[PDB]
Symmetry: D3
């Protein structure tokens, strides 16, 4: 998949495309409709399926540092776009271009001159151009007889509107299961493992992995979650009895160092230290709220209840195998 | 108007004065009673009307950094004192002098030796001298046959005691209208315009002006307010279609960068960038509470409702012309 | 009293001991049971009474910076241990040793090899060894026919379980009286006096002493407390009319500089400045919640009510003379 | 003079302009040559004289926070431009536009479509377009018979090349005399006066005014300088015996702070406190390097030598006429 | 290769090992001698080759934050060890164990009980046990007829002693060529690429990749260097025309930040943005010292000289064969 | 000895005093001359000997945070004054009083009204009153026949002028021997011992005590020094084999911290941890400059040389008798 930053970087010889336009933060189930419609039409005409997206978040252009929390990093937005068969991602920076353009010169410049588009696919809520004057309705009439438009209704399911906003709310409430349901996959973060408390290994109280994320990263509410930890492919040696590319059962503790988030993972039935490695943490279900511990005894007692509840939640998760990982490790007991 | 810092700076040849004593933070309607009484008596005897005030706030002497928020800066206290016809302001620093003095030596030193006072005017709540032993009652009997005293009852109106404290509470609640009612004018701050998001001009989402204030500055609760923005007199060139000394209709957004306050002003129907200029923001009425925005579309939709509600509130404000500005700019519509 | 850091520092020739094991934070009334039982048995056999304790807090080993607030500093834990007749304190660092040891090798290494113990005394809640597998029950059966064990029931009194946790809760609620009741003495902190507002002396609004404590120090909730201030023995000159080693009546103001705590002490009926000195502040009873002051007058009015209420509370405290100080200064009135 | 941010802000109905392009930082004597040729030409054909300038500094686009120090602020660059009769300033942001654009498109878009120039004036060192390929030569050969092009050589005078760089070097070494000579005026900074040491007035040791400047502001080397301070036009009252709009002889002390630079002005033969005013400080000549003081006596002794030496240097500046202030205040002796 | 944290993590069923002990920071050519003798011996008797190394650095145990800069991270020390065929790394923490232990007990516990070594290999400068009393001699005389001991002299080559220290000195002066020569390979750092100036692509001035490193990471002196950048194996898409697993000719700019070090790579003849990838940067030769830029033209001029000089130096590196990358990309001209 | 803050704190019933006025920072041998003449005179006429001193430093009143480093704290200045038999210290704050006061009023108010002095003793360099106009001469001519005035010349000895300044210079260069010689005693700092590297005891490399000092505290140049450490009188238990009130031979390492200065004491031939105690550290002689260590072996090697060299230098200090501690502990060899 090609990734272009700004219209100037798009090749001039690109002859045909089917284009979809949005922030696509989270690539949730609504976003997948747009991507699917786009990829299908591109196959039909032998064109490329292009996603036009935005970075920085268009909101932070007008209101710096008051933009919505990023459900996925931009890099993951790329990976997700690819996984649903997008051929090229054009990334637009509204501080550089396409902000003050009229709806008319936007269609002309972006969809025609730059992308040589024959089809465009947007959500009913899509807007564009100076002061957001261009709507889904504008696009259909500016494009009349120039390129076909397909406006897709916002996705409603089980009485919930599926959007970046609702995914953020579920995450913020700690309801990862509903977030997962809306995303169409386990919500996950990825990151390098740093040193934490003591060492990963024989001791149950020491995390198998510690990770840190900047405050622009959307994360579940502080608490303990059941989920899966996967060491991303690597040739570097791993300390302990975990193998790369296998999804291990884990009780996951999300915290805050006072506004900057930690993820501390206790991998079930494994003695490992993952320092140095890049690790994916998939969230499955909420286990408990954060609590302060009065003693080592009380701490480990609770840690053991976490493990128990996680084993139950994950044994269930594996049965919904469309969202479960391919290769996993979960023991029936300790 | 003369401004003296400490008794030592008051000229020795000053022969007669009518004196009023207080913090006078905000110069609210109660303060105006004292200033009026003082100026009138000074006219009568051909004396100077002197305000003795305090800086730092007397509270912060005993309790550093736990003093009340300053309704006006000291500089504005000066400007306000002048506007009601005070001839000289003596500013007292209790860390330098007049703290450990008995009520007796206070009257002797300040009112007689320093100010050559024939009349003094205080509020019923006025205190002075070591451990605040001197009251309004003390002053009348220490001054018996030495200078005339006039003790003015605290101002009650519409069931509200008008004081610095109540003005702070209204400000803190976001009720600028009641604060304004108590102040006898639109509450305002002044400050240099810095760079903010993008540039002031054609784009509605970009503030016409961004300002920052330290946390000792009393400001309305975070939210959006209707008010008026005035470029203070200047010869420096102005970017866009705003003229100096004219009060422009503006939706004002008060925020916090996390405890340090921003004021972001969206001037109605004008394309301007006020970087470099000194700007006065007058607050008129509360419009809405702060909210987080999920998209550019939702942001501008709300921005447009702000403008609408501001136009209404300001069209009303102009009709109460004792508080409205002399020269204003407000359009009937977009 | 000897103080040893780590098993390596314990003398090899130590021939017999009676040992008690715990964090002992606060040395509350429950802790005193264990210490008393231990000292009594050590007297019987002509052995040394040894306390094994822990530093850092065992919780912070697994969960850095999320450990319980220290009721006493370690230094005070030493002083308290001594005051109840402990002969030696062994301080264990779980990052250095005794964490991954089995219950068996723990008893062998610590109690036998290191301490040459003939008696051990623990609380019913005591645990030890890898993943806290060793309980009070384990200890009795590992030690069968090797050394006598005495497991003491947790102390319940007046429907309250007396523990570090409950003492922290009372402190956190501002209920020092109940904390005191649980500790078996007035809760106190000690620390050097720094410069604060103005100078200690004639002025009532200026603290006699200002102190600062790091955020790991357990302190009562912000507010004003009645208590006693004692200048710890010194040959250094004291400014004003306070003598060392005498416990002076004081209204104590606990605050926060924003999470880092201040203690500002207003010594009743004394003009003193305690800069430079080491000072103990004993807390007796809660007086009022913190409040913001609108004027010097209101501030001193409230300060005077504090003094009044403190005089009452302390006059009562002196009558419970088991917790009252030996030599005190309290005037009947101003 | 108008100020436009980006090509899109430029009036579309602009028929004819004389244009000069450059950073113009400092508006030094070399820059004046460009502006003069442009302005004299503009009042030739009866068109508008336009400056195209850049903010942020083009170097900072590539090396953020490693651009050269601003000789003047952008605000002052505007004011200086206007003083030399520029009719409009167009401000280009290279992060936004005109960056990746080829030399060919740059001339067409900026000079033709946007500005409709009949005449352009650049320095022989002018470079533009993608990868700075376009040079002074490119400009003459791309403007074929459409707009006339006048290329001015860099200014050499007294063996010294006059550039923003050489001005920065002079400033940096503390040679304000040579900086001024290259600038064609006294180097100055402008800023609000804040609080500092004590209060301005009778005491020689307390500054008349304190100002702080960010690390992006070019200032002379740490030390003491002869200069003039002017209170910018204002109706706000002045504490002490200074008028606005008069340049007052001052010894000026420039210090640093572990950003952040301070300017402390000791105004000669005046007792005043300038808190709250906007104040322009002009540098004339270096007096001495910074030094630490061991006693009050030494500081006051040296302070008196600073005044004597300032008195002399400023006398010379008045007689050299050329750069002196129109209205000033300077006593021959104390 | 296995990785064990502490003696307790070592498999208890380990019957036979060949062991080498040392910090091994950098795994330089002197270190390779130790590893080779150990590995060749291990595949002799058919046992495991073990490295005993130390983290944190033993110097930091005594002088926290004053230990020598890490030539490689511990992660890289593992990878290098594995590359030279070490079967297990055992990592000792001196705060935890083997510190206060006498020479006698150190050999028994570590080499015998834990590792069951038949053979140990140390550098002649090896010291161990309490107060570093145990030396290369102690080791031969304490291992009497149990395990054979091979002491290797420090490596001298071309008159230079090869040590972690001499490598650090070379790095520190910017002599990466000599550092590499002592290391036996190109010195490298590895890290995630983050955002920086603009976006990687068409523009020469914007880096292909930006990386930041803590102050504990040894880096060459501030300046520009010839090197190779490699995108570490990944299935994540690459923006622009680079493959993973190919070393690309790059000019490398190493800067500082008032920790904290930056590495900015300008990849030759490629338009790419490497945001989000893990990237290995190899240093070959110094090009020039850091310098400030006065204009875009100068920066681009110098940038082009950096490319020419890199092009040459890298050609020499390819032909010198020995340290060149297996798969690389380098154009002869632009 | 009494301590009074401000003229108002001085007893009103003071009939007769002998007074000395000065900063007295360090109470060096020149200062002792002043105190001696004052004290010998006070026990002459049978009056009180009074020191008038200043806090904050008068230079800091004018140049905040740019005053000279305090040779001793104000606490220590009090203690030293008392040791030389001063009966009362009166501490003047120049921000509060005696600043703008003319020479005439200064003598009347301070020396007469406040202190009722029959005799005053100043250094020939003494200056006072507004703008330091009043000199040693002014004092003799303003005290006409009321109080006798004894002016003492600055102390010259061995060609060196003894002043706070020359002491600071000696300290700053690391020449504590010359500082001590000018002071008349071992320069010392006093402070609570906190935690540092490991724990004090058996290991040579871990300091017996760690102390930190603000940047306002004069300390010898970064490096290692011979000195004596004394545990200040206490009933708190000592961990290890040190008594309070004995000076113990120590090698002293003074470091810096990107304020903030550290003092790490390695007590010779003692295994102890002094956490929590107040500790006085005396400097005798410089041993070496600071250096970085490459290995544990090197650090311990150098540490042993520090001990040998300290052992020698301290032997000389004991025999030179004059400045040695009364009770000390120093072994001839290890």
């Amino acid at each position: 998949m090609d990734i272009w930053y700004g219209t100037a970087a798009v090749p001039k010889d690109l002859d045909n495309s089917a284009v979809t336009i949005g922030v696509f933060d989270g690539v949730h189930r609504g976003h997948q409709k747009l991507i699917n419609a786009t990829v299908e039409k591109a196959r039909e005409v032998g064109a490329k399926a292009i996603m036009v997206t935005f970075d920085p978040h268009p909101v932070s252009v007008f209101l710096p540092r008051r933009a919505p929390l990023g459900i996925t990093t931009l890099a993951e937005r790329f990976a997700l776009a690819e996984s649903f068969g997008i051929d090229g991602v054009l990334v637009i920076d509204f501080t550089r271009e396409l902000s003050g353009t009229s709806p008319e010169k936007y269609v002309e410049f972006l969809l025609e001159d730059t992308l040589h588009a024959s089809h465009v696919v947007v959500g009913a809520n899509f807007t564009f151009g100076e002061n957001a004057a261009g709507t889904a309705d504008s696009l259909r009439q500016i494009c009349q007889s120039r390129l076909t438009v397909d406006v897709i209704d916002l996705l409603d399911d089980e009485g919930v509107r599926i959007s970046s906003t609702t995914v953020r709310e579920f995450l913020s409430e700690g309801d990862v299961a509903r977030a997962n349901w809306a995303l169409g996959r386990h919500f996950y973060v990825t990151g390098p493992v740093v040193r934490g408390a003591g060492r990963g290994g024989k001791e149950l109280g020491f995390p198998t992995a510690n990770q840190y994320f900047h405050d622009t990263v959307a994360l579940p509410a502080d608490g303990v979650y059941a989920g899966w930890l996967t060491i991303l492919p690597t040739e570097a040696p791993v300390s302990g009895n975990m193998e790369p590319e296998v999804a291990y059962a884990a009780a996951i503790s999300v915290g805050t160092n006072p506004e900057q988030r930690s993820v501390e993972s206790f991998v079930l039935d494994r003695d490992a230290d993952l320092y140095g490695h890049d690790v994916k943490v998939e969230f499955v279900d909420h286990v408990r709220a954060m609590e302060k511990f009065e003693s080592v005894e009380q701490l480990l007692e609770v840690m053991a209840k976490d493990v128990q509840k996680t084993r139950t939640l994950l044994a269930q998760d594996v049965q919904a195998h469309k969202m479960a990982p391919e290769t996993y490790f979960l023991q029936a007991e300790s």
